[PDB]
Amino acid sequence: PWPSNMKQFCKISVWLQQHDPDLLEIINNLCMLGNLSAAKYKHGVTFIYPKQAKIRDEIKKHAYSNDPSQAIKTLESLILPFYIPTPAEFTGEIGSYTGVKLEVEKTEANKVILKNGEAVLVPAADFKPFPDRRLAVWIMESGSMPLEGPPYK
Amino acid sequence: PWPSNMKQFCKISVWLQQHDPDLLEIINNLCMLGNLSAAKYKHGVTFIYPKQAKIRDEIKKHAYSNDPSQAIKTLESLILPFYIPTPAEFTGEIGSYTGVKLEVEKTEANKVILKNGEAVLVPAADFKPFPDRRLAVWIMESGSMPLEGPPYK
Amino acid sequence: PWPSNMKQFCKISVWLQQHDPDLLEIINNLCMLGNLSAAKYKHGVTFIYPKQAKIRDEIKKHAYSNDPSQAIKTLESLILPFYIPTPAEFTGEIGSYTGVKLEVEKTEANKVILKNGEAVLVPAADFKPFPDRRLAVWIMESGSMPLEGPPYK
Amino acid sequence: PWPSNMKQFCKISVWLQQHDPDLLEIINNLCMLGNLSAAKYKHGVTFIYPKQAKIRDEIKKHAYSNDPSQAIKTLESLILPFYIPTPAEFTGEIGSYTGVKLEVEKTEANKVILKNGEAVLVPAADFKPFPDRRLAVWIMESGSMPLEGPPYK
Amino acid sequence: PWPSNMKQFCKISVWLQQHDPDLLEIINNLCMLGNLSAAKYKHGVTFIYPKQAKIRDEIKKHAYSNDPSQAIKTLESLILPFYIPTPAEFTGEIGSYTGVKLEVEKTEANKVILKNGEAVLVPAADFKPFPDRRLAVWIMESGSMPLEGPPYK
Amino acid sequence: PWPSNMKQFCKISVWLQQHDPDLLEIINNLCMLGNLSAAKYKHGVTFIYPKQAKIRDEIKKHAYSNDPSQAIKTLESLILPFYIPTPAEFTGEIGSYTGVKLEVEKTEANKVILKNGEAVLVPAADFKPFPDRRLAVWIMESGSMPLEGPPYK
């Protein structure tokens, strides 16, 4: 009824449960849940959620295929072992669980645009972590996250 | 995965399930499923879906309340025992289950703005009925549907 | 969360779902949902809910058994094609789906003890029908409902 | 646990749920549940279940496609408005919802091979109806049911 | 059917799943599942289940609010990082995951009453752990667990 | 629809979810999920799935009884803390989570037969792990896995 969803999240999965459960089920079925989770010695986690259903559908198609490794690498490109809560923080030697270094083309107050795919990233308006949870969620509005390229140090 | 949602529909409930399952459960729990279904005698069914969760949540609050009569009336005003696929057919003595006559203020080829609540209705971009099934679903972007007023004939 | 259960009811099944969903599934699986529903011709429906899980479990054992005819008979004896809201109306030629006439031993303003099984019935504290819907639900605290005996007229 | 599946059935859908819940959901989503149910006027219902997932998957692909009319036709050819419990009753002017007359090539006491698709039908080892309920379920091991051909009378 | 629930639990969540699933879902959604779980270097776990639905509902209201931290502290006050299986064991420097030390007012053979909230605690009759699982579950029948006060050493 | 199941599994639970969910739920409810999971310092995991529903049903009966320890030991006898992908690998000092050493009676290209229960084991045709996942799943077609006997070193 009136209390559908959570408004503050201690984990990114609770947020993803409320937006694309199927995507979360595939993240779990491919043993990638650990990648979403904040662990000590890891900087924190930032997740890139594809707004466009065509991109998410393609991950699903591949995840249920005879070669799901294509879904693993797309998924690895959407998860950053860094805490990147704002556009200002989206700089330096950072990248996804593919080792690829992300390069910012244009940076705006509430938007980041990336080289190598022209991904348009905006912070997810309804993802609010707890204080001292180092979690972030961005919506990818268009383009694609980089799959290949030179890595970060 | 990729095949999640039906593209064509023989009942509105199957559409509703893909958009607001909670709203569909409440409709069923209030013995109002029959109001969404094409009987022989009944011309057809048009359902108005409130886009702003504010309105859908308020229906859910009232449905699980000690007096659910207000949820029933709101739902009655969102179900039309007439087949109104486009704005051109939105004219004459047509109304909801409440019986209040609908009075259109402006039409706009794909948009309809009604008097008595200033409801703004746009056909649903993902609802196509089976042929020979007189079912329509509109999205109410803003405003509200008429609750009381002169009856239609 | 806070809004979990409906406070008012237009069908007994919605009440049953909040108390014993398994029992409701078995009722449906045995094509006995219709027996809980107010038809035009039928006076009303009163359902007797067995409080002791012992009796509900025994119905479930028998329902999934190779001969479910005994589950059907027990369920028949717990559904009454009459609207009996309080002990005062618990009199005359009234009975269950089996057809055995119910004979009250003691009434007690909010309690009814029947002959032929020593069933102890108390109205359900959380079942209120919509007005003009002739639906009642009693809790059988002990005893059992009549299985066989002289029919009512 | 141990009591999971019903051993006797008053409706085919309860059997289908224990074997292919997805197929049952699609049947319901296509307003074809009524075709599996014994009406007064209708003689009885026999349902043909495709054993090879290849055929059931192809129905699901077509059901969620932009033209589900082909799923409807396949399902029509698997539902028989006649009560055909054994091979001996598989004769005369009997057919599916499509209306094509079924022509048996070989019978074999517990096996039936039809013309016009070479369907191989064997009664389902776990479907027993309630007595006085004219319901049958066969397993199609190979082949396909007739889609088009001369009608039965 | 007849085997509804587990009778012996290796974790407290299996017990809570059978009594208040929603409460368990909120415990998981707030990353408090670890607190219920026995870990080496932790004494063991004791969980206080509020019998009264009004208390549990308030946790839910707060958990789905803009400030769920109120639900976290109520939940922390219901979980004890100690193994406290009987009234005799409910003594000494013990308390919840708020640091607050619990003080016993009256101790009975099957009941404990606490200062600072007048909580009435009785061992949950259907919670039986495995041998050498250091798990306990009490029902809080009335009053409240302490939220604030001097801590244990 | 067409993408029912996963074709490649990073965990054995995803496979078991697609064949006996209830068995998986009981494995989780008895805190035996960890045994299915590959951990560093553990060789790998091999799971023996009983083809025969009578064996799996007996585990369920016992798991929901007052003494579920009988289900724990049967379950321990079905899980091997070794990676055993083929018949050639099924030799040496290996066994289940009971310490009992498995002895091969007859070994075939696609089948292994065991002493002390005459278990007939065949690799599960639809279990394909990822490269460098050390996971295997066999179907036990008849007989039983050893419960008692001399242990492996």
Q: What is the CATH number of the domain that holds A53?
A: 2.30.180.10
List of chain F residues whose C-beta atoms are within 8 Å of the C-beta of residue A61: 3
Q: Using CA atoms, how far apart are residues D107 and D97, in angstroms rounded to an integer?
A: 22
Q: Are A120 and A143 in contact (CB under 8 A)?
A: yes
**Structure token digits, residue B64:** 């699980």
Residue C2 lies in a domain: no
Q: Are the beta carbons of A64 and F3 separated by less than 8 Å?
A: yes
- Which of D3, D10, D14 comes nearest C60 by C-beta? D3
Query: DSSP H helical segments within chain A, as ranges?
Result: 12-17, 21-29, 33-36, 53-63, 69-76
Q: Using CA atoms, how far apart are residues F3 and F16, in angstroms rounded to an integer?
A: 17
Q: Using CA atoms, how far apart are residues A81 and E42, in angstroms rounded to an integer?
A: 30
CA distance D12 to chain C (A): 10
Residues 15-34 of A with CB under 8 A from B: 22
List of chain A residues whose C-beta atoms are within 8 Å of the C-beta of residue C3: 1-3
Residue A4 lies in a domain: no
Q: Are the beta carbons of C63 and D7 separated by less than 8 Å?
A: no
* Total domains, chain B: 1
Residue A100 lies in a domain: yes
Q: Which of D99, E2, F93 is nearest to C57 (CA)?
A: E2
| Buried b / exposed e along F109-127 (16+ C-beta atoms within 10 A) | eeebbbebbebbbebbeeb
Residue E82 lies in a domain: yes
**Paired sense of beta strands D112-114 and D104-107, if any:** antiparallel
Residue A85 lies in a domain: yes
- Which of C29, C64, C67 comes nearest D3 by C-beta? C64
- The number of beta carbons lying within 10 Å of the beta carbon of residue E150 is 12
- Which of C1, C4, C60 comes nearest E1 by C-beta? C60
Q: Are C83 and C45 in contact (CB under 8 A)?
A: yes
Residue C6 lies in a domain: no
Q: Using CA atoms, how far apart are residues E129 and E138, in angstroms rounded to an integer?
A: 13
Residue span of the structural domain in which A74 resides:
12-142
Select from D4, D5, D13, D14 the residue whose CB has the most chain C CBs within 10 Å, as the one to mutate to test that interface: D14
Select from B10, B16, B133, B134 the residue whose CB has the most chain D CBs within 10 Å, as the one to mutate to test that interface: B10
| Buried b / exposed e along F1-19 (16+ C-beta atoms within 10 A) | bbbeebebbbbbbbbbbeb
Q: Which of C71, C32, F3, C94 is nearest to D60 (CA)?
A: F3
**Beta pairing partners, D138:** D48, D123
Which DSSP helix (H) or strand (E) runs through E46?
A: strand E45-50
CA distance C18 to chain E (A): 13
Residue E3 lies in a domain: no
Could you identify the residue written with the tokens 């696929």? B85
**Structure token digits, residue C71:** 């589950």
List of chain D residues whose C-beta atoms are within 8 Å of the C-beta of residue C30: 10
Residue C121 lies in a domain: yes
List of chain B residues whose C-beta atoms are within 8 Å of the C-beta of residue D63: 6
List of chain D residues whose C-beta atoms are within 8 Å of the C-beta of residue B10: 29-31
Q: Are D133 and D83 in contact (CB under 8 A)?
A: no
C-alpha R_g of chain D: 15
Q: Are the beta carbons of F61 and D1 separated by less than 8 Å?
A: yes
CA distance E121 to chain C (A): 24
